[model samples]
Target: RPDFCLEPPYTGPGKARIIRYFYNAKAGLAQTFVYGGIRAKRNNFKSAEDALRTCGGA
Candidate 1:
């Protein structure tokens, strides 16, 4: 996805921010929903990782 700019350094928080920015420019309502879902999913994954480490799975 070169045109989308998903390389290592340009990804993660940076990519997420860009996505939100694009969404805001193209469709504000969809941007809000996308960010809400992203936050929810991120929290879920973070909690799961914590549980895994606590259980000595990692």
Candidate 2:
């Protein structure tokens, strides 16, 4: 769904950062490749440009 969001430090390969990124309290940073039935979180951004623009081009 478009509601799902990609976290900071956009990485990997794809038209969009389809991988689901995570920033836990103590786990530091983590990510997931939703090649199956997984998905990301809810973010206002819809693409790499939007994500970078929102977080100062991280």
Candidate 3:
């Protein structure tokens, strides 16, 4: 199933910068990995670019 939105988790990975980061990605950019330090802050989670770094310039 696809999540249209995300509310606070009941009790998993509570309030970790990572989770919030991913949530913002899914919400706005529908992504997961952030590109770099600058990109990391753009969403709170790792940017899709960051996640795909290994494959980016490959």
Candidate 4:
């Protein structure tokens, strides 16, 4: 994904804020979720590796 960003180097993990969350059915409760914010600096990353290198990973 070329448009992936997270943590933003500002919130850090201590402020793992949730942008949007809700309850849903049909889908199993099996997806991992991380509290993070999108980083503008990493918005133009070409790949997942590129984004990780730029902003680190969750």
Number of the top TM-score candidate:
4
Q: Rank the candidates by TM-score, best first.
A: 4, 2, 3, 1
Could you say which candidate leads in lDDT? Answer: 2
Candidate 4 overall lDDT versus native: 0.33
lDDT of 2 by residue, 1-58 (tens): 1223333333433345344433321332233333222333343334444543443323
Inter-residue clash pairs, candidate 1: none
Residue 40 deviation, candidate 3, in Å? Answer: 14
Evaluate all candidate structures by whole-model CA lDDT and list the values in order: 0.24, 0.36, 0.32, 0.33
Clash number by candidate, in order: 0, 0, 9, 0
Candidate 2 positional error at 19, Å:
7.4
lDDT tens string, model 3, 1-58? 2241232222243343343333332344334432333323222333444433322223
- Give the per-residue lDDT of model 4 (tens digit) for 1-58: 1233322223324455643321111231112233355542323333444434543433
Candidate 1 structure quality by residue, lDDT tens digits, 12-55: 33224322221122221111222222322221222323423332
The candidates, ranked best first by lDDT, are 2, 4, 3, 1
Give the higher-lDDT candidate: 3 or 4: 4
Prediction 4 TM-score vs. true: 0.25
C-alpha TM-scores of all predictions: 0.17, 0.24, 0.22, 0.25
